[PDB]
Amino acid sequence: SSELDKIQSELLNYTDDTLPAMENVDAIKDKMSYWRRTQFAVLPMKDEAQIRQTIERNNRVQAEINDSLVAYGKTVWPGEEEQTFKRLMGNWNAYTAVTDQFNQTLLTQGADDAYPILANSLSTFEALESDFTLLIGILHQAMDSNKVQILSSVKTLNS
């Protein structure tokens, strides 16, 4: 019975913890990348109302990413995931500080003065990108470790 409970607990961990975590981080990263793209798409814009509308929309998307990250942080496991996510959050705070300055300059001075904020803060943004990519790798590893253990336990049952 302790054998079956081991397999059932590892299946549950895989299906209800690991896979959701991976699906969620994948989706946050895709959203952040789209969000980043939108910050460059607002610069060629010429109508001020269209510019403000896009910034308001992107701030909503920023708040969704942030809420998703805060929610994810409550679930992180000690070790590589916690340390990686702690760093990711620091770089997220950094880039949203850049983004606040970018939005403010775009709306009060124009795209020509706002673009350099993006062009010159690449170290800040790539650090955030890199952390997402490391976190996804941790979860990819967890997915594979889960599978290996599930398969191994099917053996112990003598099945």
Residues that bind ligand DLY (CB under 6 A): 13, 17-18, 21, 75-77, 81, 139, 142, 146
The residue sitting closest to ligand DLY, measured at its beta carbon, is 142
- Shortest approach of ligand DLY to residue 86 CB, angstroms? 13
- Shortest approach of ligand DLY to residue 148 CB, angstroms? 11
- Backbone breaks in the chain (C–N > 2.5 Å) follow which residues? none
Identity of the residue, 122 or 148, whose beta carbon is nearer to ligand DLY in the bound complex:
148
- Shortest approach of ligand DLY to residue 37 CB, angstroms? 27
- Shortest approach of ligand DLY to residue 51 CB, angstroms? 38
* Gap between the Cα atoms of 146 and 6, Å rounded: 12
Identity of the residue, 13 or 38, whose beta carbon is nearer to ligand DLY in the bound complex:
13
What are the residues whose beta carbons fall under 8 Å from the beta carbon of 96, sequence distance 6 or more? 62, 66
Is residue 54 within 8 A of residue 106, CB to CB? The reply is: no
Identity of the residue, 21 or 42, whose beta carbon is nearer to ligand DLY in the bound complex:
21
- Shortest approach of ligand DLY to residue 119 CB, angstroms? 35
Identity of the residue, 40 or 77, whose beta carbon is nearer to ligand DLY in the bound complex:
77
CA-CA-CA-CA torsion sign (108, 113, 115, 117): negative
SS3 content of the chain, % helix, strand, coil (to 5): 90, 0, 10
Identity of the residue, 6 or 52, whose beta carbon is nearer to ligand DLY in the bound complex:
6
- Which candidate, 139, 137, 133, places its Cα nearest to that of 30? 133
What are the residues whose beta carbons fall under 8 Å from the beta carbon of 74, sequence distance 6 or more? none
